[PDB]
Design a binder for this molecule. Structure first.
Ligand SMILES: CN(C)C/C=C/C(=O)Nc1cccc([C@@H](OCCN2CCCCC2)c2cc3nccc(C(=O)O)c3s2)c1
Ligand SMILES: [Mn+2]
Length: 295
C-alpha cells in the first residue's frame, strides 16, 4: 500500500578539470543520463557561490496548491523570512518533530498518500515562477544592480552560473526563474517547451525530490497519463493537460514506464534531458533557480 521509491538516477561528481564547461560535460554524460531522463551533478566541494538575491526587498505572493484536487473531482504576501517561518512551522507541526529530523523517505511516502487521500485535504503554498529580473538572480551577476565582491567575480563569470547558459535557439530569422519551496509544494509531470534541456540549481534549504522518465518512454507515459486522466481532461492539448498531470510514479511503473528519482540537496544541480518528463516536490523550505537551454 505504501510508496515504493523508484531507483536512483545517476549522480556525477566531476573533478575540477571535468567541471570547466557545462555544455561539454553534459555532452559527455549524455550516453548514460539520456537513458534516465534526469541526472544530478555535484560540483567540487570548494565551488560555493554566494546567494546574491536582494533579500531585504524580496516579497512575493505564492500560489496555493491543493494536493488532492484531481481526486476531489488564498493570496497572502510573504517575505523570504516570513515564508520560511510559515514553512518550518507547517512541517514541524505536520510531523510533530524538528524539520531537519524528518526522513526524506517519510515526506515522500506522505506526499503521495496525500495526493490520493480523499479524507485529508492538505493545502500548501509555492513561491514558483518568480522572475530573476524582479529581485535578482541567486547567482552573482555583473549587471551593475548589485555589488559583487572580488571573491564573487569567479561565480559571476562561471559557466555553471545559470545566467550564463546558452538560451538562444538556432532557426531562420530567456532568464532564470526562481522557486521558493515548502514541504509538499510540487510540480506536475511535464516536458519543456521545444523539448529543451533544463538545468536546476538548489541554492539552499531542504532537498527537492525529483522523478524523471527517459525520452525513449515519452510516448508511453503520455498514453498512460491520458488513459488514467479524468475523462473531462482527456482531450485537452498537452500544454493545458500538463497543468494538472499529477500521477504517482508507482502507477507509471506498473504500466511499464521507467522512472528514476533523486533528492537534490543544496549546492547540487539537476539536469533534465530533451523530452524527459519530470515532476517533483520540495522536502521543506528551500530556494531553487532554473533555466531552459538548447545544445
Ligand atoms: C509544466 N507545469 C506548468 C505543469 C504544472 C504543474 C503544477 O502543478 N504546478 C506548478 C506551479 C508553478 C510552476 C510550475 C512549472 O512552471 C514552469 C516554469 N515556466 C517558466 C515560468 C512560466 C511558466 C513556465 C514548473 C516546472 C518545473 N520544472 C522543474 C522543476 C520545478 C520546480 O518547482 O523546482 C518546476 S516548477 C508548476
Ligand atoms: Mn521543468
Amino acid at each position: 500500500a505504501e510508496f515504493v521509491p523508484p531507483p536512483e538516477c545517476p549522480v556525477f561528481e566531476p573533478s575540477w578539470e571535468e567541471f570547466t564547461d557545462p555544455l561539454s560535460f553534459i555532452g559527455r554524460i549524455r550516453p548514460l543520463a539520456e537513458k534516465t531522463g534526469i541526472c544530478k551533478i555535484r560540483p567540487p566541494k570548494d565551488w560555493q557561490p554566494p546567494f546574491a538575491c536582494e533579500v531585504k526587498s524580496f516579497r512575493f505572493t505564492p500560489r496555493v496548491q491543493r494536493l488532492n484536487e484531481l481526486e476531489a473531482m488564498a493570496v497572502r504576501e510573504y517575505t523570504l523570512q516570513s515564508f520560511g517561518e510559515m514553512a518550518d512551522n507547517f512541517k514541524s507541526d505536520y510531523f510533530n518533530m524538528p524539520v531537519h529530523m524528518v526522513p526524506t523517505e517519510l515526506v515522500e511516502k506522505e506526499f503521495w498518500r496525500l495526493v490520493s487521500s480523499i479524507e485529508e485535504d492538505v493545502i500548501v503554498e509555492y513561491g514558483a515562477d518568480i522572475s530573476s529580473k524582479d529581485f535578482g538572480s541567486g547567482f552573482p551577476v555583473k549587471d551593475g544592480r548589485r555589488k559583487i565582491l572580488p571573491e564573487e567575480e569567479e561565480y559571476a563569470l562561471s559557466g555553471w552560473n545559470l545566467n550564463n547558459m546558452p538560451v538562444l535557439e538556432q532557426s531562420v530569422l530567456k532568464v532564470p526563474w526562481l522557486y521558493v519551496g515548502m514541504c509538499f509544494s510540487s510540480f506536475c509531470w511535464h516536458i519543456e517547451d521545444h523539448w529543451s534541456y533544463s538545468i536546476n540549481y538548489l541554492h539552499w534549504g531542504e532537498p527537492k525530490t525529483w522523478y524523471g522518465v527517459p525520452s525513449h518512454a515519452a510516448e508511453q507515459l503520455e498514453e498512460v497519463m491520458r488513459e488514467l486522466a479524468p475523462e473531462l481532461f482527456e482531450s485537452q492539448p498537452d500544454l493545458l493537460h500538463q497543468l494538472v498531470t499529477i500521477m504517482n510514479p508507482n502507477v507509471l511503473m506498473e504500466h511499464g514506464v521507467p522512472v528514476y528519482r533523486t533528492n537534490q540537496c543544496a549546492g547540487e544541480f539537476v539536469v533534465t534531458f530533451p523530452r524527459a518528463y519530470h515532476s517533483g516536490f520540495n522536502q521543506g523550505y528551500n530556494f531553487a533557480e532554473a533555466v531552459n537551454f538548447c545544445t
